[PDB]
Protein backbone atom coordinates (compact mmCIF):
# COMPACT_ATOMS: atom_id res chain seq x y z
CA UNK A 1 0.00 0.00 0.00
CA UNK A 2 0.88 3.70 0.03
CA UNK A 3 3.58 5.07 2.30
CA UNK A 4 2.46 7.67 4.85
CA UNK A 5 3.20 9.01 8.32
CA UNK A 6 1.75 5.87 9.96
CA UNK A 7 4.13 3.38 8.30
CA UNK A 8 7.13 5.72 8.23
CA UNK A 9 9.56 3.65 10.27
CA UNK A 10 9.29 0.87 7.69
CA UNK A 11 11.87 2.89 5.73
CA UNK A 12 14.58 1.99 8.24
CA UNK A 13 14.06 -1.74 8.66
CA UNK A 14 16.28 -4.28 6.90
CA UNK A 15 14.03 -4.89 3.87
CA UNK A 16 15.94 -3.33 0.99
CA UNK A 17 14.00 -0.44 -0.51
CA UNK A 18 14.49 2.49 -2.87
CA UNK A 19 12.82 5.83 -3.35
CA UNK A 20 12.60 6.97 -6.99
CA UNK A 21 12.06 10.63 -7.74
CA UNK A 22 11.57 11.71 -11.39
CA UNK A 23 10.99 15.43 -10.92
CA UNK A 24 14.40 16.43 -12.40
CA UNK A 25 14.49 13.91 -15.26
CA UNK A 26 13.08 16.29 -17.94
CA UNK A 27 14.25 19.89 -17.36
CA UNK A 28 13.73 22.83 -19.70
CA UNK A 29 14.16 26.55 -19.95
CA UNK A 30 11.35 28.53 -21.60
CA UNK A 31 12.30 31.35 -24.01
CA UNK A 32 10.88 33.45 -26.87
CA UNK A 33 11.75 32.79 -30.50
CA UNK A 34 12.69 35.42 -33.10
CA UNK A 35 9.05 35.44 -34.30
CA UNK A 36 8.00 35.89 -30.66
CA UNK A 37 6.63 32.35 -30.09
CA UNK A 38 7.60 30.33 -27.06
CA UNK A 39 10.06 27.43 -27.21
CA UNK A 40 11.78 25.20 -24.70
CA UNK A 41 15.42 24.22 -24.50
CA UNK A 42 16.17 21.04 -22.56
CA UNK A 43 19.04 20.81 -20.10
CA UNK A 44 20.56 17.75 -18.57
CA UNK A 45 18.46 15.97 -15.98
CA UNK A 46 18.77 13.11 -13.47
CA UNK A 47 16.87 10.28 -11.80
CA UNK A 48 17.16 10.43 -7.99
CA UNK A 49 17.21 6.84 -6.72
CA UNK A 50 17.93 6.59 -2.98
CA UNK A 51 18.16 3.80 -0.37
CA UNK A 52 16.87 5.68 2.75
CA UNK A 53 18.45 3.14 5.09
CA UNK A 54 22.03 3.24 3.84
CA UNK A 55 22.16 6.63 2.10
CA UNK A 56 23.32 5.09 -1.16
CA UNK A 57 22.23 7.32 -4.03
CA UNK A 58 22.18 6.12 -7.68
CA UNK A 59 22.13 9.37 -9.65
CA UNK A 60 21.29 8.48 -13.26
CA UNK A 61 22.19 11.44 -15.43
CA UNK A 62 19.78 12.02 -18.31
CA UNK A 63 21.59 13.68 -21.21
CA UNK A 64 19.61 16.05 -23.43
CA UNK A 65 20.42 13.78 -26.38
CA UNK A 66 17.81 11.32 -25.04
CA UNK A 67 15.04 13.70 -26.11
CA UNK A 68 16.28 14.24 -29.65
CA UNK A 69 13.50 13.93 -32.20
CA UNK A 70 11.02 12.60 -29.63
CA UNK A 71 7.45 13.78 -29.03
CA UNK A 72 5.45 14.15 -25.80
CA UNK A 73 8.59 14.45 -23.76
CA UNK A 74 7.05 14.84 -20.29
CA UNK A 75 5.27 11.51 -20.82
CA UNK A 76 8.38 9.87 -22.30
CA UNK A 77 10.36 11.06 -19.24
CA UNK A 78 8.29 8.81 -16.97
CA UNK A 79 8.95 5.75 -19.20
CA UNK A 80 12.66 6.59 -19.53
CA UNK A 81 12.81 6.83 -15.69
CA UNK A 82 11.16 3.44 -15.38
CA UNK A 83 13.43 2.00 -18.07
CA UNK A 84 16.52 3.24 -16.23
CA UNK A 85 15.38 2.11 -12.75
CA UNK A 86 14.61 -1.36 -14.15
CA UNK A 87 18.08 -1.58 -15.70
CA UNK A 88 19.57 -0.55 -12.35
CA UNK A 89 17.75 -3.38 -10.58
CA UNK A 90 18.84 -5.82 -13.27
CA UNK A 91 22.43 -4.67 -12.81
CA UNK A 92 22.43 -5.36 -9.09
CA UNK A 93 23.21 -8.80 -7.64
CA UNK A 94 20.10 -10.62 -6.49
CA UNK A 95 20.81 -10.09 -2.78
CA UNK A 96 21.06 -6.33 -3.40
CA UNK A 97 17.88 -5.97 -5.46
CA UNK A 98 15.16 -4.04 -3.57
CA UNK A 99 12.01 -5.65 -2.23
CA UNK A 100 10.12 -2.40 -2.67
CA UNK A 101 10.42 0.68 -4.84
CA UNK A 102 8.53 3.77 -3.63
CA UNK A 103 7.84 6.40 -6.33
CA UNK A 104 7.51 9.92 -5.17
CA UNK A 105 4.90 10.73 -7.81
CA UNK A 106 1.94 8.47 -8.59
CA UNK A 107 2.30 8.96 -12.35
CA UNK A 108 5.39 6.73 -12.22
CA UNK A 109 3.42 3.67 -11.01
CA UNK A 110 2.20 2.33 -14.33
CA UNK A 111 5.47 2.92 -16.19
CA UNK A 112 7.53 1.32 -13.42
CA UNK A 113 5.09 -1.57 -12.97
CA UNK A 114 5.24 -2.34 -16.70
CA UNK A 115 9.01 -2.09 -16.80
CA UNK A 116 9.28 -4.32 -13.76
CA UNK A 117 7.07 -7.18 -15.01
CA UNK A 118 10.13 -9.43 -14.89
CA UNK A 119 10.24 -8.74 -11.09
CA UNK A 120 6.74 -9.65 -9.82
CA UNK A 121 8.02 -9.94 -6.23
CA UNK A 122 9.29 -6.32 -6.18
CA UNK A 123 6.43 -4.16 -4.87
CA UNK A 124 5.90 -0.78 -6.56
CA UNK A 125 4.34 1.69 -4.11
CA UNK A 126 3.12 5.27 -4.06
CA UNK A 127 3.54 7.57 -1.09
CA UNK A 128 1.39 10.24 0.47
CA UNK A 129 4.43 11.96 1.98
CA UNK A 130 5.40 15.24 0.31
CA UNK A 131 9.08 14.42 0.02
CA UNK A 132 11.41 17.29 -1.07
CA UNK A 133 13.66 15.32 -3.35
CA UNK A 134 13.14 17.80 -6.20
CA UNK A 135 15.61 20.07 -4.41
CA UNK A 136 18.43 17.54 -5.02
CA UNK A 137 19.70 19.88 -7.74
CA UNK A 138 20.19 22.51 -5.01
CA UNK A 139 23.08 20.35 -3.72
CA UNK A 140 26.03 21.93 -5.51
CA UNK A 141 28.01 18.77 -6.22
CA UNK A 142 24.97 16.96 -7.65
CA UNK A 143 23.96 19.87 -9.87
CA UNK A 144 27.59 20.19 -11.04
CA UNK A 145 27.93 16.57 -12.19
CA UNK A 146 24.59 16.65 -13.95
CA UNK A 147 25.30 19.88 -15.81
CA UNK A 148 28.83 18.91 -16.89
CA UNK A 149 27.88 15.47 -18.28
CA UNK A 150 28.42 14.90 -22.04
CA UNK A 151 26.81 11.44 -22.22
CA UNK A 152 24.47 9.25 -20.15
CA UNK A 153 26.23 8.43 -16.86
CA UNK A 154 25.48 6.84 -13.49
CA UNK A 155 27.20 8.54 -10.55
CA UNK A 156 27.11 7.01 -7.07
CA UNK A 157 27.07 9.07 -3.87
CA UNK A 158 26.28 8.51 -0.22
CA UNK A 159 23.75 11.25 0.48
CA UNK A 160 24.40 11.03 4.24
CA UNK A 161 28.17 11.57 4.02
CA UNK A 162 29.53 9.79 7.14
CA UNK A 163 26.61 10.66 9.41
CA UNK A 164 25.65 7.01 9.97
CA UNK A 165 28.93 6.57 11.85
CA UNK A 166 27.26 8.65 14.58
CA UNK A 167 23.44 8.66 14.13
CA UNK A 168 20.69 6.28 13.02
CA UNK A 169 19.09 6.01 9.57
CA UNK A 170 15.90 7.51 11.00
CA UNK A 171 17.75 10.56 12.17
CA UNK A 172 19.84 10.75 9.03
CA UNK A 173 16.78 10.78 6.74
CA UNK A 174 15.09 13.40 8.97
CA UNK A 175 18.14 15.66 8.63
CA UNK A 176 18.31 15.09 4.86
CA UNK A 177 14.63 15.86 4.35
CA UNK A 178 14.90 18.93 6.58
CA UNK A 179 17.89 20.24 4.65
CA UNK A 180 16.14 19.59 1.34
CA UNK A 181 12.85 21.11 2.50
CA UNK A 182 14.77 24.26 3.47
CA UNK A 183 16.55 24.35 0.11
CA UNK A 184 13.23 23.92 -1.70
CA UNK A 185 11.47 26.69 0.24
CA UNK A 186 14.21 29.37 0.06
CA UNK A 187 17.39 28.16 -1.61
CA UNK A 188 19.34 31.37 -1.04
CA UNK A 189 18.79 31.46 2.71
CA UNK A 190 19.29 27.71 3.05
CA UNK A 191 22.59 27.88 1.23
CA UNK A 192 23.65 30.92 3.27
CA UNK A 193 23.08 28.95 6.47
CA UNK A 194 25.20 25.99 5.36
CA UNK A 195 28.28 27.97 4.25
CA UNK A 196 28.32 31.20 6.28
CA UNK A 197 31.16 29.83 8.41
CA UNK A 198 34.19 29.47 6.12
CA UNK A 199 36.03 27.30 8.61
CA UNK A 200 33.61 24.40 8.15
CA UNK A 201 34.49 22.70 4.90
CA UNK A 202 33.09 19.98 2.68
CA UNK A 203 35.30 16.92 2.29
CA UNK A 204 36.16 16.15 -1.32
CA UNK A 205 34.20 12.84 -0.97
CA UNK A 206 31.20 14.47 0.77
CA UNK A 207 28.22 16.57 -0.21
CA UNK A 208 27.65 18.53 3.02
CA UNK A 209 29.89 20.38 5.51
CA UNK A 210 31.81 18.59 8.23
CA UNK A 211 29.73 19.95 11.10
CA UNK A 212 30.30 18.69 14.59
CA UNK A 213 27.38 17.27 16.59
CA UNK A 214 26.71 20.62 18.28
CA UNK A 215 26.93 22.48 14.95
CA UNK A 216 24.37 20.14 13.36
CA UNK A 217 22.03 21.08 16.22
CA UNK A 218 22.42 24.80 15.46
CA UNK A 219 22.10 24.18 11.72
CA UNK A 220 18.93 22.11 12.07
CA UNK A 221 17.35 24.80 14.25
CA UNK A 222 18.27 27.45 11.69
CA UNK A 223 16.68 25.32 8.95
CA UNK A 224 13.55 24.82 11.07
CA UNK A 225 13.22 28.57 11.62
CA UNK A 226 13.80 29.22 7.90
CA UNK A 227 10.95 26.90 7.01
CA UNK A 228 8.42 28.36 9.46
CA UNK A 229 9.11 31.98 8.43
CA UNK A 230 8.58 31.15 4.78
CA UNK A 231 5.28 29.51 5.71
CA UNK A 232 3.94 32.66 7.40
CA UNK A 233 5.06 34.68 4.40
CA UNK A 234 3.35 32.32 1.94
CA UNK A 235 -0.02 32.29 3.71
CA UNK A 236 0.02 35.50 5.75
CA UNK A 237 -0.33 33.74 9.13
Amino acid sequence: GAMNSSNYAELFNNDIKLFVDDTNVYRVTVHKTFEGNVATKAINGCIFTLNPKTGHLFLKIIHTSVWAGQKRLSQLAKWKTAEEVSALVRSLPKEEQPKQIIVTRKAMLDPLEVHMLDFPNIAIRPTELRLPFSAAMSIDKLSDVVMKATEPQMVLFNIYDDWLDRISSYTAFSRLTLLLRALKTNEESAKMILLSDPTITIKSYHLWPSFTDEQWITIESQMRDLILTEYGRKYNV
Binding site: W79, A82, E83, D110, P111, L117, D118
Partner: protein
Protein backbone atom coordinates in the same frame (compact mmCIF):
# COMPACT_ATOMS: atom_id res chain seq x y z
CA UNK B 1 -40.00 -23.09 -34.49
CA UNK B 2 -38.99 -25.09 -31.37
CA UNK B 3 -40.38 -25.78 -27.92
CA UNK B 4 -39.05 -26.11 -24.38
CA UNK B 5 -41.76 -27.79 -22.27
CA UNK B 6 -41.86 -27.56 -18.47
CA UNK B 7 -42.89 -30.52 -16.33
CA UNK B 8 -44.57 -28.19 -13.82
CA UNK B 9 -44.12 -24.94 -11.90
CA UNK B 10 -44.13 -25.83 -8.18
CA UNK B 11 -42.67 -22.53 -6.89
CA UNK B 12 -43.55 -18.92 -7.74
CA UNK B 13 -40.86 -17.66 -10.10
CA UNK B 14 -40.21 -15.02 -12.74
CA UNK B 15 -39.22 -16.83 -15.94
CA UNK B 16 -37.24 -15.11 -18.67
CA UNK B 17 -36.57 -16.28 -22.19
CA UNK B 18 -34.02 -14.06 -23.90
CA UNK B 19 -35.13 -10.46 -23.22
CA UNK B 20 -38.77 -11.42 -22.39
CA UNK B 21 -40.09 -12.56 -19.02
CA UNK B 22 -43.25 -13.82 -17.37
CA UNK B 23 -44.47 -14.07 -13.78
CA UNK B 24 -45.62 -17.60 -12.91
CA UNK B 25 -47.47 -18.34 -9.66
CA UNK B 26 -46.90 -21.28 -7.32
CA UNK B 27 -48.42 -24.42 -8.91
CA UNK B 28 -49.81 -22.49 -11.83
CA UNK B 29 -50.39 -24.76 -14.84
CA UNK B 30 -47.43 -23.52 -16.89
CA UNK B 31 -45.87 -26.03 -19.23
CA UNK B 32 -43.43 -24.39 -21.52
CA UNK B 33 -42.41 -21.84 -24.14
CA UNK B 34 -43.14 -22.50 -27.84
CA UNK B 35 -42.36 -20.73 -31.15
CA UNK B 36 -38.75 -20.24 -30.08
CA UNK B 37 -36.86 -19.05 -33.19
CA UNK B 38 -34.49 -21.66 -34.57
CA UNK B 39 -31.13 -20.28 -35.68
CA UNK B 40 -29.77 -18.51 -32.59
CA UNK B 41 -28.70 -19.40 -29.10
CA UNK B 42 -31.19 -18.73 -26.34
CA UNK B 43 -31.21 -18.32 -22.56
CA UNK B 44 -34.00 -19.36 -20.18
CA UNK B 45 -33.61 -17.90 -16.69
CA UNK B 46 -35.23 -17.80 -13.31
CA UNK B 47 -35.65 -15.67 -10.21
CA UNK B 48 -37.71 -17.15 -7.39
CA UNK B 49 -40.28 -14.93 -5.77
CA UNK B 50 -38.82 -15.74 -2.36
CA UNK B 51 -35.15 -15.12 -3.27
CA UNK B 52 -34.43 -12.02 -5.33
CA UNK B 53 -30.85 -13.29 -5.03
CA UNK B 54 -29.25 -15.80 -7.35
CA UNK B 55 -30.75 -15.22 -10.76
CA UNK B 56 -29.83 -18.37 -12.71
CA UNK B 57 -30.49 -19.87 -16.12
CA UNK B 58 -29.49 -22.03 -19.10
CA UNK B 59 -27.94 -21.23 -22.49
CA UNK B 60 -29.12 -23.60 -25.20
CA UNK B 61 -29.69 -24.10 -28.90
CA UNK B 62 -32.63 -26.27 -29.98
CA UNK B 63 -30.80 -27.63 -33.01
CA UNK B 64 -28.64 -29.57 -30.52
CA UNK B 65 -31.47 -31.54 -28.91
CA UNK B 66 -34.86 -31.57 -27.23
CA UNK B 67 -34.59 -29.71 -23.91
CA UNK B 68 -37.11 -29.31 -21.12
CA UNK B 69 -37.35 -27.77 -17.64
CA UNK B 70 -38.17 -29.63 -14.44
CA UNK B 71 -38.26 -28.33 -10.87
CA UNK B 72 -36.08 -30.26 -8.43
CA UNK B 73 -37.34 -30.01 -4.81
CA UNK B 74 -34.05 -31.33 -3.32
CA UNK B 75 -31.75 -28.74 -4.97
CA UNK B 76 -34.65 -26.27 -5.09
CA UNK B 77 -34.32 -24.91 -8.56
CA UNK B 78 -35.60 -25.32 -12.09
CA UNK B 79 -33.26 -27.68 -13.93
CA UNK B 80 -32.80 -28.05 -17.67
CA UNK B 81 -32.64 -31.61 -19.03
CA UNK B 82 -32.41 -33.35 -22.39
CA UNK B 83 -35.01 -35.88 -23.56
CA UNK B 84 -33.29 -38.42 -25.82
CA UNK B 85 -36.54 -40.20 -26.76
CA UNK B 86 -37.59 -38.03 -29.67
CA UNK B 87 -41.06 -39.55 -29.95
CA UNK B 88 -41.74 -39.31 -26.20
CA UNK B 89 -40.78 -35.63 -26.51
CA UNK B 90 -42.92 -34.72 -29.52
CA UNK B 91 -45.75 -36.42 -27.60
CA UNK B 92 -45.35 -34.19 -24.55
CA UNK B 93 -44.96 -31.06 -26.67
CA UNK B 94 -48.03 -31.80 -28.81
CA UNK B 95 -50.34 -32.47 -25.85
CA UNK B 96 -49.30 -29.37 -23.89
CA UNK B 97 -49.99 -27.20 -26.95
CA UNK B 98 -53.35 -28.91 -27.54
CA UNK B 99 -54.20 -27.97 -23.95
CA UNK B 100 -52.65 -24.52 -24.67
CA UNK B 101 -50.59 -24.41 -21.47
CA UNK B 102 -47.58 -22.85 -23.22
CA UNK B 103 -46.57 -19.27 -23.77
CA UNK B 104 -45.42 -18.19 -27.23
CA UNK B 105 -41.93 -16.68 -27.64
CA UNK B 106 -43.22 -13.12 -28.25
CA UNK B 107 -41.15 -11.89 -31.19
CA UNK B 108 -42.19 -8.72 -33.02
CA UNK B 109 -41.46 -9.34 -36.69
CA UNK B 110 -39.73 -5.96 -37.12
CA UNK B 111 -37.43 -6.72 -34.18
CA UNK B 112 -33.83 -7.82 -34.73
CA UNK B 113 -32.86 -7.15 -31.09
CA UNK B 114 -32.07 -10.74 -30.17
CA UNK B 115 -30.15 -11.39 -33.37
CA UNK B 116 -28.19 -8.19 -32.83
CA UNK B 117 -27.22 -9.19 -29.27
CA UNK B 118 -26.25 -12.75 -30.17
CA UNK B 119 -24.87 -12.33 -33.75
CA UNK B 120 -21.49 -13.91 -32.98
CA UNK B 121 -22.50 -16.10 -30.06
CA UNK B 122 -22.12 -19.80 -30.86
CA UNK B 123 -23.17 -22.60 -28.50
CA UNK B 124 -19.83 -24.39 -29.05
CA UNK B 125 -17.81 -21.48 -27.70
CA UNK B 126 -20.25 -21.13 -24.76
CA UNK B 127 -19.51 -24.72 -23.75
CA UNK B 128 -15.78 -23.92 -23.64
CA UNK B 129 -16.46 -21.02 -21.30
CA UNK B 130 -18.92 -22.98 -19.11
CA UNK B 131 -17.28 -26.42 -19.09
CA UNK B 132 -19.78 -29.19 -18.30
CA UNK B 133 -19.53 -31.56 -21.22
CA UNK B 134 -22.20 -34.05 -20.16
CA UNK B 135 -24.88 -31.47 -21.05
CA UNK B 136 -25.56 -29.72 -24.35
CA UNK B 137 -26.83 -26.58 -22.57
CA UNK B 138 -24.96 -24.35 -20.11
CA UNK B 139 -25.86 -23.19 -16.61
CA UNK B 140 -24.89 -19.72 -15.42
CA UNK B 141 -25.87 -17.79 -12.30
CA UNK B 142 -25.36 -14.55 -10.39
CA UNK B 143 -22.53 -15.79 -8.19
CA UNK B 144 -20.28 -17.76 -10.56
CA UNK B 145 -16.77 -16.31 -10.62
CA UNK B 146 -14.37 -16.18 -13.55
CA UNK B 147 -10.98 -17.85 -14.02
CA UNK B 148 -9.30 -14.44 -13.61
CA UNK B 149 -11.28 -13.61 -10.45
CA UNK B 150 -10.15 -16.97 -9.00
CA UNK B 151 -6.44 -16.27 -9.59
CA UNK B 152 -6.58 -13.08 -7.46
CA UNK B 153 -12.06 -21.24 -5.73
CA UNK B 154 -14.02 -24.20 -7.18
CA UNK B 155 -12.92 -24.61 -10.84
CA UNK B 156 -15.79 -26.83 -12.04
CA UNK B 157 -18.11 -23.83 -11.60
CA UNK B 158 -15.92 -21.19 -13.25
CA UNK B 159 -16.49 -18.85 -16.21
CA UNK B 160 -13.43 -19.63 -18.36
CA UNK B 161 -13.33 -16.31 -20.19
CA UNK B 162 -10.10 -15.42 -21.98
CA UNK B 163 -7.81 -13.68 -19.52
CA UNK B 164 -6.98 -10.09 -20.49
CA UNK B 165 -4.56 -8.08 -18.34
CA UNK B 166 -3.00 -4.85 -19.63
CA UNK B 167 -0.06 -5.11 -17.21
CA UNK B 168 1.19 -8.59 -18.11
CA UNK B 169 4.07 -10.02 -20.06
CA UNK B 170 1.50 -11.39 -22.50
CA UNK B 171 0.40 -7.82 -23.25
CA UNK B 172 3.85 -6.14 -23.25
CA UNK B 173 6.68 -7.07 -25.60
CA UNK B 174 10.08 -6.67 -23.91
CA UNK B 175 11.58 -3.45 -25.28
CA UNK B 176 8.22 -2.11 -26.46
CA UNK B 177 7.07 -1.40 -22.88
CA UNK B 178 5.91 2.14 -23.46
CA UNK B 179 4.73 1.55 -26.99
CA UNK B 180 2.66 -1.57 -26.23
CA UNK B 181 1.10 -0.11 -23.05
CA UNK B 182 -0.12 3.10 -24.74
CA UNK B 183 -1.12 1.35 -28.03
CA UNK B 184 -2.43 -2.14 -27.39
CA UNK B 185 -2.63 -3.02 -31.11
CA UNK B 186 0.00 -5.77 -30.71
CA UNK B 187 -1.91 -7.39 -27.83
CA UNK B 188 -5.23 -7.11 -29.69
CA UNK B 189 -4.26 -8.22 -33.18
CA UNK B 190 -1.34 -10.66 -32.73
CA UNK B 191 -1.82 -12.10 -29.24
CA UNK B 192 -5.59 -12.10 -29.04
CA UNK B 193 -7.12 -12.06 -32.57
CA UNK B 194 -4.55 -14.10 -34.53
CA UNK B 195 -3.27 -16.02 -31.50
CA UNK B 196 -6.15 -17.04 -29.23
CA UNK B 197 -9.50 -16.10 -30.73
CA UNK B 198 -8.33 -16.84 -34.32
CA UNK B 199 -10.85 -14.37 -35.82
CA UNK B 200 -12.90 -11.34 -34.83
CA UNK B 201 -16.20 -13.26 -34.67
CA UNK B 202 -15.08 -15.52 -31.81
CA UNK B 203 -13.85 -12.40 -30.04
CA UNK B 204 -17.14 -10.61 -30.55
CA UNK B 205 -19.02 -13.72 -29.50
CA UNK B 206 -17.23 -13.86 -26.12
CA UNK B 207 -17.77 -10.12 -25.71
CA UNK B 208 -21.46 -10.46 -26.39
CA UNK B 209 -21.82 -13.52 -24.16
CA UNK B 210 -20.10 -11.70 -21.29
CA UNK B 211 -22.50 -8.79 -21.70
CA UNK B 212 -25.52 -11.04 -21.69
CA UNK B 213 -24.48 -12.81 -18.54
CA UNK B 214 -23.87 -9.49 -16.80
CA UNK B 215 -27.25 -8.24 -17.92
CA UNK B 216 -29.31 -11.34 -17.18
CA UNK B 217 -27.71 -12.60 -13.96
CA UNK B 218 -25.80 -9.55 -12.75
CA UNK B 219 -22.64 -11.61 -12.96
CA UNK B 220 -19.98 -9.15 -11.88
CA UNK B 221 -17.04 -10.97 -13.51
CA UNK B 222 -18.86 -11.01 -16.81
CA UNK B 223 -19.24 -7.25 -16.59
CA UNK B 224 -15.49 -7.04 -15.95
CA UNK B 225 -14.81 -9.24 -18.97
CA UNK B 226 -17.11 -7.24 -21.29
CA UNK B 227 -15.48 -3.97 -20.32
CA UNK B 228 -12.00 -5.33 -20.77
CA UNK B 229 -12.70 -6.50 -24.29
CA UNK B 230 -14.19 -3.15 -25.26
CA UNK B 231 -11.21 -1.35 -23.77
CA UNK B 232 -8.67 -3.54 -25.58
CA UNK B 233 -10.14 -2.50 -28.98
CA UNK B 234 -10.62 1.21 -28.17
CA UNK B 235 -7.09 1.37 -26.75
CA UNK B 236 -5.57 -0.02 -29.98
CA UNK B 237 -4.54 2.52 -32.61
CA UNK B 238 -4.75 -0.03 -35.41
CA UNK B 239 -8.01 -1.92 -35.73
CA UNK B 240 -9.56 -3.48 -38.86
CA UNK B 241 -12.26 -1.16 -40.13
CA UNK B 242 -14.81 -3.97 -40.26
CA UNK B 243 -14.28 -4.58 -36.54
CA UNK B 244 -14.92 -0.95 -35.58
CA UNK B 245 -18.10 -0.69 -37.57
CA UNK B 246 -19.42 -3.97 -36.16
CA UNK B 247 -18.36 -2.95 -32.65
CA UNK B 248 -20.40 0.27 -32.88
CA UNK B 249 -23.43 -1.85 -33.86
CA UNK B 250 -22.76 -4.43 -31.12
CA UNK B 251 -22.42 -1.88 -28.31
CA UNK B 252 -25.37 0.10 -29.59
CA UNK B 253 -27.81 -2.77 -29.19
CA UNK B 254 -26.27 -3.68 -25.78
CA UNK B 255 -26.73 -0.15 -24.47
CA UNK B 256 -30.16 0.03 -26.04
CA UNK B 257 -31.25 -3.17 -24.28
CA UNK B 258 -29.87 -2.51 -20.80
CA UNK B 259 -32.50 -1.70 -18.15
CA UNK B 260 -32.28 2.01 -17.43
CA UNK B 261 -32.18 1.37 -13.67
CA UNK B 262 -28.99 -0.77 -13.81
CA UNK B 263 -26.70 1.71 -15.59
CA UNK B 264 -24.90 2.39 -12.28
CA UNK B 265 -23.31 -1.03 -11.62
CA UNK B 266 -23.24 -2.39 -15.18
CA UNK B 267 -21.44 0.52 -16.87
CA UNK B 268 -17.86 1.33 -15.85
CA UNK B 269 -17.54 5.11 -15.93
CA UNK B 270 -13.81 5.05 -16.57
CA UNK B 271 -13.83 2.63 -19.47
CA UNK B 272 -16.73 4.29 -21.26
CA UNK B 273 -15.40 7.83 -20.89
CA UNK B 274 -11.99 6.59 -22.06
CA UNK B 275 -13.41 4.66 -25.01
CA UNK B 276 -15.84 7.35 -26.18
CA UNK B 277 -13.72 10.44 -25.55
CA UNK B 278 -10.01 9.73 -24.98
CA UNK B 279 -9.18 6.58 -26.91
CA UNK B 280 -7.76 6.13 -30.36
CA UNK B 281 -11.30 5.17 -31.41
CA UNK B 282 -13.19 8.07 -29.76
CA UNK B 283 -14.48 8.95 -33.23
CA UNK B 284 -15.40 5.43 -34.39
CA UNK B 285 -18.43 4.67 -32.16
CA UNK B 286 -20.85 7.24 -33.46
CA UNK B 287 -23.99 5.27 -32.81
CA UNK B 288 -22.79 3.96 -29.44
CA UNK B 289 -21.74 7.51 -28.47
CA UNK B 290 -25.09 9.02 -29.55
CA UNK B 291 -27.19 6.54 -27.58
CA UNK B 292 -24.91 6.75 -24.46
CA UNK B 293 -25.23 10.57 -24.37
CA UNK B 294 -29.03 10.65 -24.85
CA UNK B 295 -29.74 7.87 -22.33
CA UNK B 296 -26.97 8.05 -19.68
CA UNK B 297 -25.46 11.57 -19.83
CA UNK B 298 -24.93 11.31 -16.06
CA UNK B 299 -22.34 8.54 -16.31
CA UNK B 300 -20.38 10.75 -18.69
Amino acid sequence: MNTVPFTSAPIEVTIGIDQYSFNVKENQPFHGIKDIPIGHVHVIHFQHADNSSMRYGYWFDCRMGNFYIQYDPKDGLYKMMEERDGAKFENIVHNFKERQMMVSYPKIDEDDTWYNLTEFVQMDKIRKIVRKDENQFSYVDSSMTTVQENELSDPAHSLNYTVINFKSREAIRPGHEMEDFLDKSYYLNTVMLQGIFKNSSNYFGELQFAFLNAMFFGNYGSSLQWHAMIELICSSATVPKHMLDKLDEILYYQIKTLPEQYSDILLNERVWNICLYSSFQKNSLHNTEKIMENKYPELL
